[PDB]
Write a protein that binds this ligand. Structure first.
Ligand SMILES: Nc1ncnc2c1ncn2[C@@H]1O[C@H](COP(=O)(O)OP(=O)(O)OP(=O)(O)O)[C@@H](O)[C@H]1O
Ligand SMILES: Nc1ncnc2c1ncn2[C@@H]1O[C@H](COP(=O)(O)OP(=O)(O)OP(=O)(O)O)[C@@H](O)[C@H]1O
Ligand SMILES: Nc1ncnc2c1ncn2[C@@H]1O[C@H](COP(=O)(O)OP(=O)(O)OP(=O)(O)O)[C@@H](O)[C@H]1O
Ligand SMILES: Nc1ncnc2c1ncn2[C@@H]1O[C@H](COP(=O)(O)OP(=O)(O)OP(=O)(O)O)[C@@H](O)[C@H]1O
Ligand SMILES: Nc1ncnc2c1ncn2[C@@H]1O[C@H](COP(=O)(O)OP(=O)(O)OP(=O)(O)O)[C@@H](O)[C@H]1O
Ligand SMILES: [Mg+2]
Ligand SMILES: [Mg+2]
Ligand SMILES: [Mg+2]
Ligand SMILES: [Mg+2]
Lengths: 491, 74, 62, 506
């Protein structure tokens, strides 16, 4: 075999993207993390996927948990290991200690186990093996140097045996050493770190491939979730800048707007509506989501600021009947506070719900509502993930953003969306004669020509009624105009 | 090699020995050591830095979930 | 000799600028770093270029 | 000298100042530092200088490095320790272990060493002793209490023998304990700490004398560089305020300007040029330097923004041939990315180039280029350095600065390198009738009267043409003024009808 390293796909959502193909075959891969990081889960889902996809038998070696429980817990993800154990596709080799015993049995068992193991590998023709908590074994009474030799022996034997192993280790600090003995690191050909970071009382689990001897992989930490379907990793960096782009147009829900957008919204495009509180964003979203049901197309509405019922009232109070839309299974409303999840989880729920409803349009009400509390960067990383998925999925998306300051706002998005968004619709409050009147404007459109006028618009029970331009005013944008009332040329 | 059951002082000497004998042989060697803190001790026992005539430090610093590889001649 | 220390080119892209010539001849160079940093590689490449660029045989103790 | 303890000079540039005279005789100095900080070098330079400058034989005790190596490495700075060992002025006492040794021997050897050393001192009639890596010896298997005793004994015998000693020591943290066993600090009479601070991927070495029993000394850390000549220290805080001050004017390379300054700049004066990007500081710099060459005076131009080529392509397009200034050995251009080193290094390079060329005019195009990255104090320390060395060197100087914001800049320098400057030249963009015109202003001059107007200036192939002030305008500085007029059409040369001639004749 005089060729580069060959990888065996795990089929774990996202992992094969990061490891550029998956775990190298015939080599051990250390996957350590602190208590509760999903180590056990990783190894399991690793053997399971192996079986249920390439019929590659699996040998799972446990040192602490019990076979009954391992199977018991796996049911949490909808899979029966018992069945696989039955059909000899998976052999759970129990190596845990019993409530009673003796001691001074150090490297005494590491020799035997390497036998019981090779047995079940041959016997079941296993191709993948996972050893859960090797660490818990030397946790009898050993030193850093004793653990390196016991680890090296095992890893080595397994490589002769030709198995593609996954060894679970434990850490104590999220960012400190890699494994309890700060020795495992150097004994494994590959090291994958699972982290469960706790910043601001919130938890965020990430996965990192520190190294893969002999090949390439993605560097750094990568957010991931643990759902009913197992570990789900989002390689927000893996996503490519290869999204389809058409010239097909669509209606904004507001005829007059569609003209300003010089013919409508591009099916393929991201729309950003930004304005002070009260300007009318939630209105546009409302009108946008309705137009997609007038044409009998599916559309989702992810609201993070208003409730189900209140979204209906105000909707109904502008015309548009959302009650029907839902029945006609043409419109779907979600709703959830940003504080009810992390961006990692939300981004997932968004993707998830788009797959179960195949939207042709989408409206996220208040991007700024998801920016609440989250760092500026951890946010942007959520925008691209949502903006991109929709973009490569041909979905037309509308995102609402309240600007921290009414009148005076010197920037579209405080967070900086600029260049991530295709079309920018800007609403601003204008003070004309001691009165708070509105104004809408098509700030930018990457394809079309759109209108360059700042138009005053009103709101009624009929919806948005875009009027004219304050042609005879100055510093409109500023928010506190000044009518020129120029004395002509004065004759 | 020393990761069998040794201590800094015993390590410092063993290394001194290896480094020396190699000098006599006239070999231009490249030795590889391991660390545990990106900015902690230069080497595992806090003694190798001071025994080697030359020292190169490869780093894989984290910071914002990204990794940045650098190299330094100490 | 009776002059400064002579260096030996590593041919590793950039390193010979950083080291003002390369590794000091007749002496060893300690190269350390945490797991996954480039140690082994640095050593393999150093022997390699030595071979493929000056026909300087190399020994690799592992 | 009103100090109570006798000192011996290291002759190491900058150290003797920091220690108010050198190292106390008959006593011992701990030079401790992490790996690669300059410990051996300090101790080696300490003996060399004592031999080369005062004919004082020296003893060098080495515990790890081989005597051949100590000699091989010292050739880095052009030192022939071999010729000295030979003349019998320098004696290297090798106490390193054997590449084929045993184990155990660090106490009676501490008595055998003392006696070995005494023998060498007596034989070579030595006045200076360096002990490199004392730490490595207890690095066999010892604890703080054993170390304190052995160090004391050694040090105490040395004191008796009369020897002025330097002892090297190691440490793992740049800011933690002084030495390994947190015991060496207190046994030594004096303590010098060498650091190599990382900080933002760069390396900054400093030298600090922590204590000197008996006299005072400079407190705190001091930047320094190891070059082909050994350690080189900059006591940036020992720089006094006694620069000579003349009423000598010189030209700026721009006639109108010189008028504006009430007759050209003062020879002895720091000049500051600030304006928005594109205003034209770099032109006055080119003009300033060319005039030093038009009067047959040398002048350096340290460039930190433009390549050596561009500086010439642009310079020529403004007239003035830089190619010639270089040939006539009158104008010297430097060029370097601020990033290619740390201020310390940069400040030295500058100092160096100033010696190897005896300038009469120096220009640093873009201080704010050097401002990149560096903290504000680390930058000000530099600005004090360049502005200081120049003032005491009678060297006139032009410093450039780019204000991070075109039009609307409420302050001269975002750095406050104001009070450090004698004359200030302020350029800015004025918005008049849909266009960006320039505006130059002699903001301040300390000994001169200088013109108070904010003139308008054009940049042609010829260079900078200083016109007049926007009298009939308000909010000038704002960036976008308001045109108010009590006049404009007022005289100056009304007389309507046909006033011009055209290309044919007149
Ligand atoms: N169906 C599920 N849906 C969402 N999360 C789940 C589900 N099942 C388990 N989890 C989560 O996954 C974790 C399970 O961890 P697991 O047993 O895989 O190993 P570990 O945390 O790596 O190591 P340890 O042996 O210390 O627990 C739990 O902490 C829990 O938060
Ligand atoms: N029936 C109605 N008749 C007239 N104007 C209405 C009616 N309903 C709502 N409005 C107007 O619309 C505004 C409601 O704001 P909207 O729901 O459009 O979202 P928003 O202003 O973009 O964002 P947010 O409500 O989160 O601040 C009110 O401030 C009001 O002036
Ligand atoms: N072809 C390749 N392309 C890109 N990156 C690679 C390639 N091959 C290896 N790598 C990277 O280089 C690393 C290999 O490290 P290497 O084996 O050289 O030594 P080390 O990490 O310093 O020490 P150790 O022996 O403990 O791994 C991998 O972790 C991986 O990120
Ligand atoms: N000619 C030279 N020009 C510039 N720097 C030099 C020159 N020679 C040596 N150096 C620098 O000086 C350092 C030498 O350090 P030195 O031998 O003085 O003792 P040390 O670093 O204090 O202690 P140790 O024995 O642990 O290395 C080198 O790390 C190198 O960067
Ligand atoms: N040949 C020329 N003819 C007319 N105008 C020129 C000519 N060369 C340069 N200029 C003008 O002078 C400006 C060049 O700026 P200059 O080199 O003087 O330094 P600066 O503005 O102070 O700083 P920086 O160049 O770093 O922005 C140009 O913006 C341009 O308007
Ligand atoms: Mg576990
Ligand atoms: Mg809203
Ligand atoms: Mg290695
Ligand atoms: Mg310039």
């Amino acid at each position: 075999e005089h060729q580069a390293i060959a990888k065996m796909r795990t089929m774990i959502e996202g992992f094969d993207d990061i490891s550029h193909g998956g775990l190298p075959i015939g080599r051990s891969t250390l996957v350590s993390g602190t208590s509760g990081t999903g180590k056990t889960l990783f190894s399991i889902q690793f053997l399971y996927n192996g079986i249920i996809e390439f019929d590659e038998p699996g040998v799972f070696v446990t040192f602490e948990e019990t076979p009954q429980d391992i199977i018991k817990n796996a049911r949490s993800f909808g899979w029966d290991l018992a069945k696989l154990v039955d059909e000899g596709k998976l052999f759970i080799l129990d190596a845990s200690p019993d409530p009673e015993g003796q001691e001074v049995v150090g490297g005494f068992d590491l020799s035997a186990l390497i036998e019981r193991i090779n047995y079940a590998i041959q016997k079941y023709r296993a191709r993948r093996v996972s050893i859960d908590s090797v660490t818990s074994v030397f946790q009898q009474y050993d030193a850093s140097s004793v653990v390196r030799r016991e680890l090296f022996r095992l890893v080595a034997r397994l490589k002769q045996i030709g198995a593609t192993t996954v060894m679970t280790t434990e850490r104590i600090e999220e960012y400190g050493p890699i494994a309890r003995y700060g020795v495992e690191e150097f004994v494994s050909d590959n090291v994958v770190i699972l982290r469960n970071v706790l910043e601001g009382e919130r938890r965020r689990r990430t996965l990192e491939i520190l190294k893969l001897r002999g090949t390439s992989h993605m560097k750094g930490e990568y957010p991931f979730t643990i759902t009913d379907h197992g570990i789900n990793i989002f390689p927000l960096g893996a996503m490519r800048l290869t999204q389809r782009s058409s010239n097909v147009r669509v209606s904004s829900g507001v005829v007059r707007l569609d003209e300003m957008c010089g013919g409508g919204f591009f099916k393929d495009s991201i729309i950003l509506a930004t304005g002070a509180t009260g300007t009318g964003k939630t209105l546009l979203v409302s009108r946008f989501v309705e137009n997609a049901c007038a044409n009998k197309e599916r559309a989702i509405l992810f609201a993070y600021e208003e409730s189900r019922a209140q979204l209906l009232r105000n909707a109904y109070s502008w015309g548009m009947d959302f009650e029907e839309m839902e029945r006609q299974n043409l419109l779907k409303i979600v709703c959830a506070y940003p504080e009810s999840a992390g961006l990692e989880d939300h981004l997932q729920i968004i993707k998830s719900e788009i797959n179960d409803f195949k939207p042709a349009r989408i409206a996220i009400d208040s991007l700024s509502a998801l920016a609440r509390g989250v760092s500026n960067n951890a946010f942007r990383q959520f925008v691209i993930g949502v903006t991109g998925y929709a973009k490569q999925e041909e979905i037309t998306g509308l995102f609402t953003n309240t600007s921290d300051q009414f009148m005076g706002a010197h920037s579209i998005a405080d967070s900086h969306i600029s260049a991530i968004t295709d079309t920018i619709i800007l609403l601003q409050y204008v003070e004309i004669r001691g009165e708070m009147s509105r104004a809408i404007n098509v700030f930018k459109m990457r394809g079309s020509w759109h209108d360059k006028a700042i138009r005053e618009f009103m709101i009624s029970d009929k919806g948005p009624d875009i009027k004219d331009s304050f042609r005879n005013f100055e510093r409109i944008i500023s928010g506190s105009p000044t009518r020129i009332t120029v004395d002509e040329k004065s004759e």
